[PDB]
Each structure stands twice: as structure tokens, then as C-alpha cells.
């Protein structure tokens, strides 16, 4: 029951370090990351999945200064996913996407492929040429992926917490992201909460629909 899932999930504030994902769960979270939708199937993303103690420690380097209050979340979780966006949408990437759709059998003719390519380039060009906002456009797709992921892991029975409170300059440098054409946006530790997760026993709060919703 997905409504139950959405109401019962919460942002975990403390993880049980003794509780790890099963091998199947580890495969399943990667599937969730991969199969998120995105505008034009542009998939303008990279994920770092940290499962080792060293890998997690490397990510937790970003929980520094004002962000130290998120360090233990990264360290004690089973798996920590860093969601990264491309910094620029280039034609090489657009070619990878369309070539992949072709390999998967989505095009009946070379002319269907070309038309799909031209449509995708229309949207990309709107951002990278007209509005000069392709960085933010791609970042939006990554945040969409994040929303999909949080509901997904909850439906798997897994605890998680989305994290914007991290130093992306430190995290980018740690994984050489800038040179590779990426930048880190959101860190999401995943696992099982401990008894120290104070947010497990607080009521969920949201603004009333009277404020956020209009019907016509």
C-alpha cells in the first residue's frame, strides 16, 4: 500500500551500524537509481554508491564545518548514495542516450531515431543555448531521481535520509568530479534506523492542502 508507505517513511537521524542491506537490496537500490525517468530520457546523472567503510568515510569527509551534524548518518548507514548531476549537457551524452534507446529497440527506422534525436536536442538547446540554465535543468532531473529513490527504498522496507547539508566542494574534490564533468547534489545514506533516531517518534508534519492545493 503505497499511501501507507508514504505516510510511514521518515528522514532517519541515526542508523544502526550493525544492520546492512542484503545483496539483493544492494542490487535493487541501483536498479531504482538507473530506472528513474528524466526529461527526454536525458539521464544527466552519476551515482556514487559507497558500501565499504573506506568508501563511506570518503563521502563523510563532506560532512564538515556546519555539516558535521550529518557525519554520523553517513558513517553508520549500510550504503550511502551520492547523487551527482552533469555540469554541462554535451552532444556526446545526447548521442549515448539515443544510441542506447536504439540498442533497446525503441526505433523502427533510422528516421525515427533521427527525429527522437532532434526532439531531444530541441529541449537541450532550449536550456544550454537559449536560457543558459542546462546545469539547473539537469539538477532538477537528479532531484526527481532522488524523490523516486526515497519512496522506493521505503517501499523496500529500508530507512534513509536525504542530505543537502554537506560540502559539495569537498565531495567533488574527493571523487575528482569537476574534471569528469559532474557535481554532487544530494547524499542519501540507506540502512536501518537505531533507537537513537529521534525522528522515528515525531509526528509527520505538512502544510494543509488549503494552502498548497487548488482544484479546477
Q: Which three cell numbers stand for residue 140?
A: 532538477
28 forms part of the interface with ligand FMN (CB under 6 A)? no
- Catalytic annotation on 20? no
DSSP string, 48-96: EEE-SHHHHHHHHTTS-GGGGGGHHHHHHSSEEEEEEEESS--HHHHHH
Q: Which of 27, 53, 136, 164 is catalytic?
A: 164
- Catalytic annotation on 136? no
| Partner whose footprint covers residue 68, from a copy of itself, ligand FMN, none (CB < 5 to 8 Å by kind) | none
- Catalytic annotation on 164? yes
The site that binds a copy of itself (CB under 8 A) totals a number of residues, namely 75
Closest CA to 32 of 91, 81, 101: 81
From the CB of residue 34, how many other CB atoms can be counted at a distance below 10 Å? 11
Q: Which three cell numbers stand for residue 93?
A: 551524452
Q: Which three cell numbers stand for residue 112?
A: 525515427
| Partner whose footprint covers residue 92, from a copy of itself, ligand FMN, none (CB < 5 to 8 Å by kind) | none
Minimal distance in Å, beta carbon 208 to a copy of itself? 8
Of the pair 15, 150, the CB lying nearest a copy of itself is at 150
Of the pair 37, 118, the CB lying nearest ligand FMN is at 37
57 phi and psi, to 5 degrees? -60, -40
| Partner whose footprint covers residue 70, from ligand FMN, a copy of itself, none (CB < 5 to 8 Å by kind) | ligand FMN
- Cα dist from 18 to 56, 70, 158, whole Å: 15, 19, 14
Minimal distance in Å, beta carbon 90 to ligand FMN? 19
Q: Report the distance separating Cα 162 and Cα 183, nearest Å.
A: 16
| Partner whose footprint covers residue 75, from ligand FMN, a copy of itself, none (CB < 5 to 8 Å by kind) | none
By CB under 6 A, the residues from 69 to 108 that bind ligand FMN are: 70
- Cα dist from 173 to 62, 89, 150, whole Å: 10, 21, 26
37 forms part of the interface with ligand FMN (CB under 6 A)? yes
132 forms part of the interface with a copy of itself (CB under 8 A)? no
Q: Under the rule (CB under 6 A), what is the footprint of ligand FMN?
A: 10-11, 13, 37-41, 70, 144, 161-165, 186, 199
Amino acid at each position: 500500500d503505497i499511501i501507507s508507505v508514504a505516510l510511514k517513511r521518515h528522514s532517519t537521524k541515526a542508523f544502526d551500524a550493525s544492520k546492512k542491506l542484503t545483496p539483493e537490496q544492494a542490487e535493487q537500490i541501483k536498479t531504482l537509481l538507473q530506472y528513474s525517468p528524466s526529461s527526454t530520457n536525458s539521464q544527466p546523472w552519476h551515482f556514487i554508491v559507497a558500501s565499504t567503510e573506506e568508501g563511506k568515510a570518503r563521502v563523510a569527509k563532506s560532512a564538515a564545518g556546519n555539516y558535521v551534524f550529518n557525519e554520523r548518518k553517513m558513517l553508520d548507514a549500510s550504503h550511502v548514495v551520492v547523487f551527482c548531476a552533469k555540469t554541462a549537457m554535451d552532444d556526446v551524452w545526447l548521442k549515448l542516450v539515443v544510441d542506447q534507446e536504439d540498442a533497446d529497440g525503441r526505433f523502427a527506422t533510422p528516421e525515427a531515431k533521427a527525429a527522437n534525436d532532434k526532439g531531444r536536442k530541441f529541449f537541450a538547446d532550449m536550456h544550454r543555448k537559449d536560457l543558459h540554465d542546462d546545469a539547473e535543468w539537469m539538477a532538477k532531473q537528479v532531484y526527481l531521481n532522488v524523490g523516486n529513490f526515497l519512496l522506493g527504498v521505503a517501499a523496500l522496507g529500508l530507512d534513509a535520509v536525504p542530505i543537502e547539508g554537506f560540502d559539495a566542494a569537498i565531495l567533488d574534490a574527493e571523487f575528482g568530479l569537476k574534471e569528469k564533468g559532474y557535481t554532487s547534489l544530494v547524499v542519501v545514506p540507506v540502512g536501518h534506523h537505531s533507537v537513537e533516531d529521534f525522528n522515528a517518534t515525531l509526528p509527520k508534519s505538512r502544510l494543509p492542502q488549503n494552502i498548497t492545493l487548488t482544484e479546477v
